[PDB]
Amino acid sequence: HHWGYGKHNGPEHWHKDFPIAKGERQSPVDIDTHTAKYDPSLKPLSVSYDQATSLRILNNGHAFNVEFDDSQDKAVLKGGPLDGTYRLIQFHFHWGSLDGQGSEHTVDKKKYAAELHLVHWNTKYGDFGKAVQQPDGLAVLGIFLKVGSAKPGLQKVVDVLDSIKTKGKSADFTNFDPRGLLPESLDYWTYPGSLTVPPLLECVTWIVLKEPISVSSEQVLKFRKLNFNGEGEPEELMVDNWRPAQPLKNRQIKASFK
Numbered sequence: 524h525h526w527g528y529g530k531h532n533g534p535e536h537w538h539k540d541f542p543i544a545k546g547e548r549q550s551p552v553d554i555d556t557h558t559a560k561y562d563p564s565l566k567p568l569s570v571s572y573d574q575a576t577s578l579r580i581l582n583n584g585h586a587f588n589v590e591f592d593d594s595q596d597k598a599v600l601k602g603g604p605l606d607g608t609y610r611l612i613q614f615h616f617h618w619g620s621l622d623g624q625g626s627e628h629t630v631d632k633k634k635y636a637a638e639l640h641l642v643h644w645n646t647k648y649g650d651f652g653k654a655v656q657q658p659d660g661l662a663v664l665g666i667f668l669k670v671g672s673a674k675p676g677l678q679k680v681v682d683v684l685d686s687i688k689t690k691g692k693s694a695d696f697t698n699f700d701p702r703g704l705l706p707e708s709l710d711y712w713t714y715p716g717s718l719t720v721p722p723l724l725e726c727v728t729w730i731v732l733k734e735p736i737s738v739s740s741e742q743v744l745k746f747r748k749l750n751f752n753g754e755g756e757p758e759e760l761m762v763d764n765w766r767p768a769q770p771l772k773n774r775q776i777k778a779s780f781k
């Protein structure tokens with residue numbers, strides 16, 4: 524009876540195994556654009572992905588991860604609100620059963636069709652497993668997806684999904700360039716938060732880009748053909764693998780713009 528996204532094991536149940544679910548800096552949150560404060564002391568985000576080494580893509584039974592070699596400074600995030608250098612380890616998405624839902628963060632209560640998370644860890648802590656135990660251990664760059672024109676840089680991901688349909692399947696995924704998933708503007712909101720999945724650790728500096736990327740209806744439909752179940756089990760479509768917005772509590776969301 525492990526955690527997941529269903530009626531019986533979804534986000535409203537998580538607190539029973541992971542009490543930090545009702546903590547003081549949980550994610551995601553609603554971004555109220557009117558009350559976010561412009562902070563002119565925030566710096567531009569530095570996204571240095573030119574040397575990224577993708578390795579593999581994995582269906583983990585909740586979503587899929589695209590994994591990177593993080594054993595050297597190859598793909599790093601710095602600047603913005605961050606001190607020091609954060610190394611890209613993986614990215615993944617959350618998405619809906621319908622185009623009107625799927626994102627974890629919301630913007631003035633607006634849900635997007637999906638949300639991309641590029642997960643990076645603070646190199647001062649040496650490994651990811653050490654970084655997640657620290658209040659400034661992770662930086663996750665979140666990017667909203669809306670349905671419209673196709674995103675050409677997403678298509679290599681969509682095309683490999685049929686090879687990892689079920690839980691525990693993986694496939695080689697080299698030479699993928701995550702720059703193709705970025706929107707044009709790096710304007711962002713930022714706040715202190717958590718992993719949005721168990722173990723819900725409060726170790727994340729969230730950086731959420733204001734500008735969504737557009738993906739096509741055919742692209743997101745392919746996401747919705749994945750399966751939460753393993754091979755040779757009844758089909759449970761992998762959809763609605765998002766956690767709702769959590770109370771902001773004693774936090775301020777800062778804007779890098781306007």
Ligand SMILES: NS(=O)(=O)c1c(F)c(F)c(S(=O)(=O)CCO)c(NC2CCCCCCC2)c1F
Nearest residue numbers: 583585586587615640642663717718719720722
């Ligand atoms: N949504 S998130 O960006 O807070 C996040 C992380 F930051 C994170 F570090 C990870 S992790 O896999 O690197 C360490 C915790 O497992 C996941 N993991 C999920 C990735 C796919 C989303 C659905 C749940 C399965 C693990 C993860 F979801």
Ligand SMILES: [Zn+2]
Nearest residue numbers: 616617640719
């Ligand atoms: Zn995520």
